[PDB]
Amino acid sequence: GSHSMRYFFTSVSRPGRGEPRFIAVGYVDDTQFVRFDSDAASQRMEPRAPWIEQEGPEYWDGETRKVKAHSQTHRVDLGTLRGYYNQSEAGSHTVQRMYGCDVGSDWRFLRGYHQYAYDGKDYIALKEDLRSWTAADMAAQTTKHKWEAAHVAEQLRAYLEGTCVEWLRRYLENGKETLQRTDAPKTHMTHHAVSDHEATLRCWALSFYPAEITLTWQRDGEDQTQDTELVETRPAGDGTFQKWAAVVVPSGQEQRYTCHVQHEGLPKPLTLRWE
Amino acid sequence: AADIYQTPRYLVIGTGKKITLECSQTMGHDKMYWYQQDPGMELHLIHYSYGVNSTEKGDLSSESTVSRIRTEHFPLTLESARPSHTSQYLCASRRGPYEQYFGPGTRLTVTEDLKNVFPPEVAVFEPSEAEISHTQKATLVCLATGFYPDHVELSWWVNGKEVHSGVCTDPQPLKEQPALNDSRYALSSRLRVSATFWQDPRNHFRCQVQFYGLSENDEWTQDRAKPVTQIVSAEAWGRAD
Amino acid sequence: AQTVTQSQPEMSVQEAETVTLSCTYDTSESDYYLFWYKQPPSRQMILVIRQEAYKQQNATENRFSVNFQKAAKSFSLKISDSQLGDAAMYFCAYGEDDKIIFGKGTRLHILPNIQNPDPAVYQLRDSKSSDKSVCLFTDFDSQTNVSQSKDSDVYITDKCVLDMRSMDFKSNSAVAWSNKSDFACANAFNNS
């Protein structure tokens, strides 16, 4: 259906022990396709998905040039933010930045975003009009004033409505084989007696893509939550995702329970029972 | 106007000297840049800065450094000047990706010695009777000769007042020995006046050359007078004959 | 390649006529800003025009306008109704967040209108306090080839435009000089 391109940046000061650590990663949907790590040997943007490797050296020089501009600007920002918040040069602080754009099934522009954080809290963010800013703090108002006056929103909006969307479409095209795919979950269920009184049914979904999924339990066809549990969706390490949900049941009652699985890769949702 | 300042405006130093060119701006701009403009007029990026603590390298700067400990200041240090550092140094500030705002520049000459520095000799040449006869106008010529470095500002003064009307000066000085490194230079200018104005003996004409030479700081041991920054002038009066 | 190309290092235009300075560029990017700067004899870099790549309207500032053709990566500067004060270096330039890259520059000469030319070479004598007497080639029209010397010991200056404001009179001139061997302020010029 809908798609996104997103870049994630983290800068971490390590005072005395060198320049800040800087990590950039780019995603299309739930697939990483590029990375930059300041402590890696190449000092270049590097590919992480097959289809981006057909971009030529001009692309790789360009992305490397730009990503360094991101890095060196964050390095300045770390000093600035320390000042804004009257913090010691002792100790480590973090700048994070995320931006990107969403397009629909027909690849039309849906929205854009550009969010910035300091020490893991909202600092400033571009609103949905792609024209104005939400500043979290009194400190962030200074940034908001500067960026207003310097028309940062105008520059970012041009990217988010234009370049971002155009290159996302290019990427979706070039990596159709693997981005425009669904991997339906492989499911199964496991049962572990917690004693003689009760047991645990575990509903598994494995090897699915994209990450979006929903697992729910039912008792006698009615939605059960009170003694459920559901882990955070997790990467398998091969490009697909895993998730499970479990429930504890009095034994000789397992057959009362069904697990329901919904995923883009399934024409119909699955109903699972203990076998 | 533009509030970005460079000092000094002119400088001549000997090979091997460590020198700092100052650049300061009070406009609150986060980004600053240094460009070297060689003769031939190309701009080469040397250093730049995203903000305080940022000192990013540009190109083959041999071998310069910058500091950026505060927003206002982005000084450029040449550790051991070389003749190839002879250039126009342009500092610029910038907001985001918008236009750079350049300071007025520093014109630097790195000479092989210091004994090579000479002030100009200045001469004024009087209108020809043939020109006066034929055109009813009278053209004075100023000639500034034998100066190094080529750091001069020439102006004309009529009856004690600087004039700009009726004047043009050579776009740049020419080398008197065009195949030597530290060749001395020459520069001419014209002041054209009506024949009637030239024919009035009350009228006083002065060609003034501001020369930018050695610093008061520099040591000097030669007999010929330290060729510091100075004015050298030559004058003439109007004549009916 | 991140390059800015100005293929014509020098151009001339008659006073009050229009001239177009050419510029093309190469970049991996679609988001950038483009600029024209003017640097007069003062050597002060002055912004002429800024163009945002994402703006379809061409920037215009009085007599200066650009022809921004993004698909062709071309960014010509047109100077209409050219003035003598327009004489300068003109730099095309390309900008992103990181830096601005400048083209090599085009020197623009403006040829003044000379109302009654009278090309002639005069000899001028030093009002003594000096050295070496001088001759003045003057009152020639603006498309004049002023060659530059050799014979080691003569000096010939570039031509130079003179404005007698109160009389609304403009004239060109060039100077030649040399004292040692020989020289007449009759040849040197009108005979190069």
Partner: peptide, 10 residues
């Protein structure tokens, strides 16, 4: 494709 314009110091 990364942003080329609008990365400004806070």
């Amino acid at each position: 494709k990364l942003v080329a314009l609008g990365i400004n110091a806070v």
